């Protein structure tokens, strides 16, 4: 089975071509921390710690072109599938993990054995190591699950509230000419307030969720980075 | 001065980007693509009827049956298949003629 | 149900179907056509890359002796749990 | 005897149970901001920084509720 379909970004691609044929400065980035990993001067890393910047920027642009514009009615999030997001996070996360593993430095994993020598190795430390190795994969799964669920829940709520507002607006506006007009005006004002609140909440949540999506990947990278001191 | 992004053409830069900048990511992506097309590229007729149609499956015309009929007619005509062969029917040709005369 | 239906791709254009047997056979023919010429010896890494893994996987399938039944991959109906056939 | 019974309304019950998860999530979020205030009145020079962390906490804590909510939808639309 081969399905031929298209993304919902063609107009946005047209706008990108029109508005970015000439150069422009970028000074606001959703996830700026990918550019500043080191905060104490004289510290440097021999690992390619800035390799994630390009992927981070492209991912932010792509997910923003989809998620933020999805607030417009009838706009479709073409990639909104659980397993597709799993594939995306698998790519990024496992690629970086395999980059660290291909380094063939086993000492890098010494920190997985949690605790000190005082703790019993077999009954405490080894079980903590098992849990931490499990937690890495669980972090990948939680990242993709969190990205999927936020979009799904937010848009379900928006659809349901919009349906209710359409119903009351169309089939009960006549009460403005009736003696119970005050009740309808109260309800209508409440619906407008709820409309604005939901839109603001979704706008904030989309950006914040992209921030956390990139932060999880950068945290994976940072967990295995070692910094040398210049002398 | 020479820069890959400014001096190289797009296909060349694409190869360079995914071979000397993000080779592991490309490898993992290809791995995942192969897995998807090896294990997630099939849909049964019942699955199509349940979920494969926007408004629902139009049983009143049964497009799946027409599609399969076209498929099998094309295969038979192109491959010169004798569908009256005993292996397809489970009985000899003479028995088939007897059945035709009976019914 | 109706709200759930709003989360589908909105620009589906065409769907094509192909049997696994057919395109696997066509791919094998292409591979044989490109790996046949004399100027590609059997001991070259390219030839082994093309052939060895496929041979190994097919051998693993043939050697399989499972006590359970694996339903046909391409049945007409695979949605009924109580009917593997 | 052996009866294959299919009850339909049960999907409501389960759905409601999932919503109970939010009772924690909501509460948890409040706790964060509670402490945030007690942290801003204890070292106001860091207010902005603290706010950022709070938002991070909110986004992590809220995430969990969504999981529960998803399940509700799955059972409510099936």
């Amino acid at each position: 089975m081969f399905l031929f379909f298209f993304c919902d970004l063609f107009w946005l691609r047209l706008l990108l071509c029109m508005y970015y044929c000439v150069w422009s400065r970028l000074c606001f980035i959703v996830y700026f921390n990918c550019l500043m990993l080191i905060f104490d001067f004289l510290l440097f890393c021999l690992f390619d710690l800035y390799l994630f910047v390009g992927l981070c920027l492209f991912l932010l642009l792509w997910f923003m072109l989809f998620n933020l514009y999805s607030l417009i009615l009838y706009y479709c999030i073409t990639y909104l599938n659980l397993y597709l997001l799993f594939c995306i996070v698998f790519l990024l996360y496992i690629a970086f993990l395999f980059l660290f593993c291909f380094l063939c430095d086993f000492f890098l994993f010494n920190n997985l054995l949690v605790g000190d020598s005082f703790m019993d190795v077999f009954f405490i430390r080894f079980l903590l190591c098992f849990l931490e190795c499990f937690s890495l994969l669980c972090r990948c799964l939680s990242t993709f699950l969190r990205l999927f669920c936020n979009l799904l829940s937010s848009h379900f709520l928006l659809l349901m509230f919009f349906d209710f507002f359409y119903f009351i607006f169309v089939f009960f506006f006549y009460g403005v000419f009736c003696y119970w007009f005050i009740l309808f005006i109260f309800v209508f004002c409440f619906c407008l307030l709820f409309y604005v609140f939901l839109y603001l909440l979704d706008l904030f949540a989309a950006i914040l969720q992209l921030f956390i999506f990139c932060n999880m990947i950068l945290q994976l990278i940072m967990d295995f980075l070692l910094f040398l001191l210049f002398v | 001065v020479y820069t890959r992004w400014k001096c190289d053409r797009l296909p060349v830069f694409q190869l360079k980007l995914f071979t000397q900048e993000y080779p592991m990511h490309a490898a993992v992506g290809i791995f995942t693509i192969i897995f998807l097309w090896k294990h997630m590229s099939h849909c049964s007729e019942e699955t199509e009827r349940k979920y494969g149609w926007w408004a629902g499956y139009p049983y009143w015309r049964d497009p799946i049956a027409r599609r399969n009929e076209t498929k099998y007619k094309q295969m038979i005509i192109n491959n010169d298949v004798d569908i009256t062969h005993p292996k397809w029917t489970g009985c000899s040709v003479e028995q088939l003629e007897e059945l035709s005369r009976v019914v | 149900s109706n709200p759930a239906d709003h989360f589908r791709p909105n620009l589906k254009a065409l769907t094509l179907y192909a049997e696994r047997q057919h395109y696997v056979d066509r791919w094998l023919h292409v591979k044989e056509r490109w790996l046949a010429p004399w100027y590609l010896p059997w001991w070259s890494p390219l030839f082994q890359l093309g052939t060895w893994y496929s041979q190994r996987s097919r051998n693993l399938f043939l050697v399989e002796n499972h006590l359970s039944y694996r339903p046909y991959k391409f049945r007409r109906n695979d949605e009924d749990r109580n009917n593997p056939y | 005897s052996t009866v294959a019974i299919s009850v339909q309304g049960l999907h409501y019950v389960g759905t409601g149970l999932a919503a109970i998860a939010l009772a924690g999530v909501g509460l948890g979020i409040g706790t964060i901001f509670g402490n945030l205030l007690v942290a801003c009145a204890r070292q106001p020079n860091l207010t902005k920084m603290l706010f950022n962390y709070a938002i991070l906490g909110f986004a992590l804590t809220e995430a969990i509720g969504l999981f529960a909510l998803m399940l509700a939808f799955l059972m409510l639309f099936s």
Binding site: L3, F58, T78, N81, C87 | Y51 | - | -
Partner: peptide, 29 residues
């Protein structure tokens, strides 16, 4: 829910893979 479905997952994921392998270089340059 199609978001929970897998009957056309490969073709669906081709959109992401095309964005990653073919559109990202153009946006990059």
């Amino acid at each position: 829910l199609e978001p929970m479905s897998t009957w056309y997952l490969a073709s669906w994921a081709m959109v992401w893979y095309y964005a990653f392998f073919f559109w990202m270089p153009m946006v990059w340059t």
